[PDB]
Design a protein around this ligand. Structure first.
Ligand SMILES: O=C(O)c1nc(-c2ccc3c(c2)/C(=N/Nc2nc4ccccc4s2)CCC3)sc1CCCCc1ccccc1
Length: 141
């Protein structure tokens, strides 16, 4: 839904404010706060245990959605758990952060459309199948 939309933005803008950048190119906030937190732990703790997915996608302004998708597919080669969804978000942040690093901040809005597309096309059936976002929270919060 658009629940996923505003979630991609929260995660992205946070990841940028953290790197010193600026996105300007209730119980809900609890999910955002929870995803903000898990991504931070993901980065501190695991990110460097897996192959670098950003190394596999050579991000450019003329990169297509299906390029991104086919890379993101790799993440979920062995199924969907919440962790990999976290890693997914972390990935979008790193694409975003790298983009701004390389003077391609135009991509950022694209990367967010991309993730949102990927979420609804690939992951929402799972999330609702596994208790929605309020469930992710009860576990990882
Ligand atoms: O749980 C898993 O099975 C799992 N498999 C994972 C997996 C499976 C397959 C692949 C990978 C990871 C790969 N990851 N490569 C990445 N490279 C990058 C680069 C930048 C940002 C994010 C990423 S993720 C590359 C090869 C395919 S990631 C993952 C979750 C790791 C823990 C997440 C977490 C951390 C703190 C709090 C809550 C949850």
């Amino acid at each position: 839904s658009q629940s996923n939309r505003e979630l991609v933005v929260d995660f992205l803008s946070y990841k940028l404010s953290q790197k010193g950048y600026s996105w300007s190119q209730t119980e809900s906030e609890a999910v955002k706060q929870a995803l903000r937190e898990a991504g931070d732990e993901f980065e501190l703790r695991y990110r460097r245990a897996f192959s670098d997915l950003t190394s596999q996608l050579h991000i450019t302004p003329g990169t297509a959605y299906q390029s991104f998708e086919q890379v993101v597919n790799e993440l979920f080669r062995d199924g969907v758990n919440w962790g990999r969804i976290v890693a997914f978000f972390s990935f979008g942040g790193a694409l975003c952060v790298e983009s701004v690093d390389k003077e391609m901040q135009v991509l950022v809005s694209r990367i967010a459309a991309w993730m949102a597309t990927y979420l609804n096309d690939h992951l929402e059936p799972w999330i609702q199948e596994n208790g929605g976002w309020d469930t992710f929270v009860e576990l990882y919060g």
